[PDB]
Amino acid sequence: EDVRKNRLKPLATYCSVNNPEISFKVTNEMQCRENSIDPTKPLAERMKIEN
């Protein structure tokens, strides 16, 4: 369950508000969110599979 051992951590790091990569292009944040990796959500919540 470690955040460090989550297979989603590198995609979660790319799909983050911190990353200037998703700030340059407007659609980048949406392309992340629609693939269930929401940059607006905090890290643990962002990688969590609900219900």
Partner: protein, 51 residues
């Protein structure tokens, strides 16, 4: 739409230029020819490549 009539409210004119032309929600595809840097909007240029 039938007719367009002027209201001459320069401040609203600026806010619309801002949202339609200068910093649109979804800008059109970036140009990647040799002579082009690859930016998609004026907004992006001065936010990341100011001189």
């Amino acid at each position: 739409c039938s007719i367009i009539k002027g209201t001459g409210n320069f401040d609203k004119c600026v806010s619309q230029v801002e949202s339609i032309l200068v910093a649109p929600k979804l800008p059109l595809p970036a140009n990647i020819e040799a002579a082009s840097s690859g930016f998609e909007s004026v907004d992006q240029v001065f936010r990341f490549a100011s001189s």
